Amino acid sequence: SAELTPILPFLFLGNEQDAQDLDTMQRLNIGYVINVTTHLPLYHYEKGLFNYKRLPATASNKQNLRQYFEEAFEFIEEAHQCGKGLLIHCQAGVSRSATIVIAYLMKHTRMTMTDAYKFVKGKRPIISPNLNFMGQLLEFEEDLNNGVT
């Protein structure tokens, strides 16, 4: 499988395998984990090593991910501000988690939707948000450009 993707020094995009790799997470100074599924475990929860957030998305073709953007960005920033990294993952790191990272880049590094997509896809070529999530990212871009987020 594809290896964990560093996006920024404090933001890593991964799959379910990556969230179980405790030696790597400790090596990369990860202190925060976002699990973008309703059904996966929060791996290593009982060791009390990380701070976790679940964004309980399903597999539905109508899944709304925008509703989670604010919450997910706040958690990323918490990690960011205390000098810890954050791992965000779903099952494959292809679609749900990747959408959230692109949106973060759009809001917090001012990247257009196209440039943020290409930034992530350049780092992690297997990503492929579905057309539903792409539609939401376009709407998010719109709302960012009018300041109405």
Number of domains in the chain: 1
Residue 6 belongs to domain spanning: 1-149
- How far apart are alpha carbons 74 and 68 in whole angstroms? 10
Residue 15's nearest CA partner among 142, 145, 123, 127 is 127
Q: Look up residue 100 and give its DSSP letter.
A: H
- How far apart are alpha carbons 41 and 136 in whole angstroms? 27
The answer to whether 95 touches 129, Cβ cutoff 8 Å, is yes
Instruction: Catalogue the E-assigned strands of 4-93.
Output: 5-8, 11-14, 30-35, 51-54, 85-89
List CB contacts of 128: < 8 A, sequence separation 6 or more.
94, 95, 98
- How far apart are alpha carbons 85 and 77 in whole angstroms? 10
Across 12-51, b (16+ Cβ under 10 Å) vs e yields: bbbbbbbbebeebbeebebbbbbbbbeeeeebbeeeeebe
Residue 107's nearest CA partner among 56, 135, 148, 57 is 148
Amino acid (1-letter code) at residue 10: F
* Marked catalytic residue, from 4, 90, 94, 103: 90
Is 90 a catalytic site residue? yes
Resolution (A): 1.9
Experimental method: X-ray
The answer to whether 66 touches 136, Cβ cutoff 8 Å, is yes
Q: Look up residue 38 and give its DSSP letter.
A: S
